[PDB]
């Protein structure tokens, strides 16, 4: 049911590393201001990965806690352990989170069966409304198709984050799901396109820097708008491409430091966006008129 | 200084996915009669993934006792966090382990000095041995030879363990080091070329149902007896390959069941090996003489 540019909203963070509360509640209001449809808390470009227990619940409240349901909030509660996705997922549910989204097991490669077996476990255990999340660049793993939608027949299965990138293969998963649950982008470059053929939204990075602009993609996109949505979209296409010149957060994390909006804190292993990178971000950042 | 066959050693659980310490302590045992060098605890095969902080310890401290000092322990610490991979590496530092061995951070793909930057923090902060461990298939990165050569001027950084099985890039990264640090095959298909090229030992599935056999490939390997090493290795060639059929540790965890020497327990998002798999794999056991 959710809609719109889902900003998957970074966790702002003093020079050594400790959150910046104030920073990410200021940001949270300002996506509010824009045009943002939705927030992720604590997903990939939250660094889930390098925060604490007490952490992902403290941003997961703050976040809450600031938007004042203006608009809903999704956690990001996906681990490698069924057991542990379980308990960060019952978690969101309890702080009052309105959808949960679940990356595939990372690392430990499971199997397709392996792969349905965990989201159902957590769809039986936590009654709140899961996205599932494929990105098999980062997991080594590939949830198929065929199994999303098999996943799509059990209840609180209500949709999935595909940042393939494979227009055709989205494109797909959408037909065959027949609107049993929702597709989101998680690919900024191809974002529009996949919300032309049937997309619910795009739980984007470049919102992060572009929330207007992304909010404006979006809905027409999703209005089936082909024009505007290629119009819109090519205003900061060119920042699709930037903000992953390094691995995601490192871009987009340095792009609203120069933006004046947070610190430079990101958390081991990640490192700060490297040196030659930074002119090529500042430039495109000015042709888009964000700085 | 660790050499030889070294077993990513499975961590046996009851059905119901509990520790199985019973097993586990005549596995250890079983491990050190027929052979085997040493034993990484907790590692990938070991299921590090879905074992609790607690767990973790419990296993390193069980086998490190069995053990009773007749063979090495290394202890699997590895994170995609930098703090935490230092937690780990601290635990079994405190825990009397010989040596960590830790995975590059997986899913949220550091940079090259990203990479440097963290395992430099955990040498800086742990005073350890540690091995790097690169296995791109699975993390989403791939520590370049070139980052693994400045690694090994730290002090603590005493080797790597090269699951990529490109023999060619392997020979390359000996010789490139001079003996620097170690270098231990992750690829029992390749194991005994690389060993035969200079490296150190195999940190091996395969050992975990043959130890006996992979003990003797190993030391003809590192005594630099080719014929015998392709001997030797050509009698268990066959499981390098079925003990992959499914994600490791899915095949192996089940040979060892066949075997008779641990219970069904694995834990999800793992799932037992498939029932198709499994005449096959005890065909295999059979051919290599294991049941
Ligand atoms: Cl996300
Ligand atoms: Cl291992």
């Known amino acids: ?33 824009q045009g943002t449809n939705s927030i992720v808390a604590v997903g990939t ?10 952490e992902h619940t403290q941003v997961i409240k703050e976040i809450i806690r600031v938007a004042n349901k203006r608009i809903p909030i999704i956690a990001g509660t996906g681990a490698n352990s069924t057991r542990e996705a379980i308990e960060l997922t019952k978690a969101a549910k309890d702080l009052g989170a309105d959808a949960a989204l679940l990356v595939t097991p990372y690392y430990n490669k499971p199997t397709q069966e392996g792969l349905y077996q965990h989201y159902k476990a957590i769809a039986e255990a936590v009654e709140l409304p899961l996205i599932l999340y494929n990105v098999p660049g980062r997991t080594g793993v590939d949830l198929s198709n065929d199994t999303a939608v098999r996943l799509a027949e059990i209840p609180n299965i209500v949709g999935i984050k595909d940042a393939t990138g494979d227009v055709p293969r989205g494109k797909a998963l959408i037909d065959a799901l027949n609107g049993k649950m929702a597709v989101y982008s998680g690919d900024d470059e191809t974002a529009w396109e996949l919300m032309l053929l049937g997309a619910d939204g795009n739980i984007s990075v470049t919102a992060n820097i572009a929330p207007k602009a992304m909010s404006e993609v979006c809905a027409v996109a999703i209005a089936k708008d082909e024009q505007q949505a290629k119009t819109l979209n090519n205003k900061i296409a060119n920042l699709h491409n930037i903000l992953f010149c390094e691995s995601n957060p490192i871009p987009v994390k340095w792009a609203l430091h120069e933006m004046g909006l947070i610190d430079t804190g990101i958390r081991l292993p990640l490192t700060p966006l490297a040196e030659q990178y930074r002119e090529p971000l500042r430039n495109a950042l000015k042709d888009a008129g964000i700085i």
Chains 1, 2 share one sequence.
């Open 1 to 33: 049911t959710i809609q719109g540019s889902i900003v998957a909203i970074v966790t702002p963070m003093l020079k050594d590393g400790g959150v910046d509360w104030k920073s990410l509640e200021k940001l949270v209001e300002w996506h509010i201001e």
């Open 45 to 54: 470009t939250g660094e889930a990965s390098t925060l604490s227990m007490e």
